[PDB]
Design a protein around this nucleic acid. Sequence first.
RNA 1: AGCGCCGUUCCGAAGGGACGGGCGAUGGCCUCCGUUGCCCUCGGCCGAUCGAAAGGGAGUCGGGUUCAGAUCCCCGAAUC
RNA 2: CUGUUUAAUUAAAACAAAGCAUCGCGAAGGCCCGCGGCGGGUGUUGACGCGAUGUGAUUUCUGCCCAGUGCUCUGAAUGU
RNA 3: GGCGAGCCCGAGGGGCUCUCGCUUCUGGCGCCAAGCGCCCGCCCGGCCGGGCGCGACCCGCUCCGGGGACAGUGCCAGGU
Lengths: 68, 118, 252, 234
Amino acid sequence: GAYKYIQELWRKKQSDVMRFLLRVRCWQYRQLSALHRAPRPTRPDKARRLGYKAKQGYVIYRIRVRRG
Amino acid sequence: KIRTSPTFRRPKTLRLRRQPKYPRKSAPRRNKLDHYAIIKFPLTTESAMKKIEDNNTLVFIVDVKANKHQIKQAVKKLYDIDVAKVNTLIRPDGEKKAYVRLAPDYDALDVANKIGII
Amino acid sequence: GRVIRGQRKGAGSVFRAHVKHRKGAARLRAVDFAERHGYIKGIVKDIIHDPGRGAPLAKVVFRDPYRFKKRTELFIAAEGIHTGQFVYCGKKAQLNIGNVLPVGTMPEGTIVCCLEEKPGDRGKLARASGNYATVISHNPETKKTRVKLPSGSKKVISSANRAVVGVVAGGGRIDKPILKAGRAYHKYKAKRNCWPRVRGVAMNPVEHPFGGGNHQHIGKPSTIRRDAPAGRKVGLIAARRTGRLRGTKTVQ
Amino acid sequence: NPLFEKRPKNFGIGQDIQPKRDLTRFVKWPRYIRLQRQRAILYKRLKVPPAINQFTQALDRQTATQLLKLAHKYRPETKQEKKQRLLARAEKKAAGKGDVPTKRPPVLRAGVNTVTTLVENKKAQLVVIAHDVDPIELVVFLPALCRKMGVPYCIIKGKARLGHLVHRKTCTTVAFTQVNSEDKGALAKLVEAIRTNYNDRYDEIRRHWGGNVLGPKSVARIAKLEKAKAKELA
RNA sequence: AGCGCCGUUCCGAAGGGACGGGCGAUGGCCUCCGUUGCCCUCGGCCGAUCGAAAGGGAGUCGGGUUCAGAUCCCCGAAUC
RNA sequence: CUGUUUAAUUAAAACAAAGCAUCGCGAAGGCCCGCGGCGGGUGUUGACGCGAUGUGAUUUCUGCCCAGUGCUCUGAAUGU
RNA sequence: GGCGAGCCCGAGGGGCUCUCGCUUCUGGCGCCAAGCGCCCGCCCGGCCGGGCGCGACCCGCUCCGGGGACAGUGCCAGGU
Ligand SMILES: [Mg+2]
Ligand SMILES: [Mg+2]
Ligand SMILES: [Mg+2]
Ligand SMILES: [Mg+2]
Ligand SMILES: [Mg+2]
Ligand SMILES: [Mg+2]
Ligand SMILES: [Mg+2]
Ligand SMILES: [Mg+2]
Ligand SMILES: [Mg+2]
Ligand SMILES: [Mg+2]
Ligand SMILES: [Mg+2]
Ligand SMILES: [Mg+2]
Ligand SMILES: [Mg+2]
Ligand SMILES: [Mg+2]
Ligand SMILES: [Mg+2]
């Protein structure tokens, strides 16, 4: 289907089309709290290949840590 | 829609009243501090009998959890006599002693003769 | 091996400022439309003495241009103002003693005080008793203004920040000798616990780099560089030249 | 009538207090408002890649409504009538004893995976895409795939509007595969205008770079400077 | 890393209450009022809370009473 | 000078003191606290202020040495 | 918008270019709108009780300013 496309697109995360998205999302997450609830996963294919299923009972949290 | 003030506040939203589908406790507990549990036994000391005839007041050793209103209600329910006032004090041993003054129409001598103490 | 007195100052345990009887922070009024497109008039109720400070604090009541309420502010009372004198605050205010107005409008050589480093800093520079700053230059394009501060330094600042006109009241405050230790104690008791000031050569080497020895001497060059660690900077700190001065220093 | 006089209040600097104004431009919005607002300004300031500029450029209010009226005839079958037809099927099968009494009804296919598996096998007559998706990466690859496969693809405004026909809150893409004989002409009349708008201009869309637009407060000052410079040159 | 810590107004959608008006429902002798649900208008906390038996803090005095109580008990006279 | 000092071997010539000098800092700063944050003290502070030293009522005097050890300043002419 | 000031062309006027609105003798007061133009239900073409707009102009993509691809942050290296 399309998850293979999304995976092969996210693999090359240094191109411009992906770098712009990553920078915008990093800026957006910098303004939020250190720990919060994302209502839907930003990476659906990566969540599926980890064990996330689109049904009730599965929650996604976004959390930042200090680099270093 | 005009914003009269530059301060944004939380909009007053509707709050549902708590409507429990089932009670958390099946039956309400029985009031253990009943009229018979409020007072325990009167005092028969000489200082207590001195207040019987000279003051028209009785002395009762009651629970520490009982206040003046509960003492008055318990006395009225048990002996069917009127109460003027109640003076309570915590004895140095931990109990509570209450001097309950009867109304002028009642006499403490007959109440004492009716309930044990003479 | 022990923390020195100058190093224990930053802990803030007992060296905090005695801010109990302080009346209030000396700050100007907030910049708004009524200040950048005109002026407003206020009435000085009274001047009061702020403990731990030589400059008196004047209470000024203004009328709120948006709400029906009187706003009370505490300004630094410039020398030459009395209770009841109307004080004007704004851009096109008349140039008089007590009135505050942006530095970009006053002419050169104007003696002002209680100004701001940046537009909106609310009166930070030249706040001590008897000090003033001198406007010496102006720039219409790329708005800048050169001012000479009481330290002789010529600093370039913005042309939008404000400054009250006049010298701070209480000048010559240092012409009187303390004349005894009691008055110095009563003075510093309102400021902070920093008066006793025991010399470093009197104590032991444990509490100061200068203490010790059978003779009360220093033994080391008191001139210490800027790269010295904490607890080491004692005596003269990066003294480019020491000894009794000969004329004017003339250092930027 | 005898004494009905006017009280003109002076709302200047220090005559009277200011009345209540809109103040919507200066109100302190919450953090979730301030975050979701300046995101559009950031998207307009930054030089967006040419793979996002495909979106935010969709059909007008006429052709989009026409495509919606066309899709309203091939909507996915709801669960109520689905249960109805499944109950009627087992009855009419025992009644008539027929193999296939109901012809397969032509219906549009929903879902990005289904749309992709259809366009890869060249089974879709048309593709319509939404642009209100939050992760753009789930959609950036589709226009190039449709350009490579030669099928007509069109972008439209409103994933909820795309969604309502499919009876769901959010739907990304919809593929038209089978069309009735009497709607085939109406569909072919619009696939041409879609091809001349998206397919034939794919190179220009891929070479076009959007965004990079400064704010009006920064454009007014450069306009003042260029005016003052032109008045000095000539 | 963490038991947690710094921070107390800072980077917070941090006022759940009321004056009045309107709609709707209910109860008391439905004459008249008391409430409940909703709408409109208005309303800076100087941010929860703790922190003094010598600080601020309304209002009891006289006489008598016991082996041990007194501005507390009794009488009499007041007050918040 | 008044004052303080080693409770339990020292009350002093010791410490402190006003006074006299010198140094750093115009706040994206000076001197410090802190494992951590643009966290805290000075700071409800702004050079008549803050921070760090020496000497030690008043008067008069403050001599000569930058070689060495320290402090500071300069030019990508110039070595490592 | 001229209740205003203009450098100009010009017979009435025009805007190439512009200052911009109305608080400075006085220890007083100043808010929750007057008026105008419309829209409803009630007194036969009336009174009373209400609603909207102008008063108080329009449009917009950062609350307003000051720095800024620096300062600061993480890692590594060399001095002290
Ligand atoms: Mg869910
Ligand atoms: Mg000393
Ligand atoms: Mg010693
Ligand atoms: Mg040492
Ligand atoms: Mg020697
Ligand atoms: Mg308390
Ligand atoms: Mg008595
Ligand atoms: Mg006694
Ligand atoms: Mg001592
Ligand atoms: Mg001794
Ligand atoms: Mg600091
Ligand atoms: Mg001397
Ligand atoms: Mg000498
Ligand atoms: Mg030399
Ligand atoms: Mg800005």
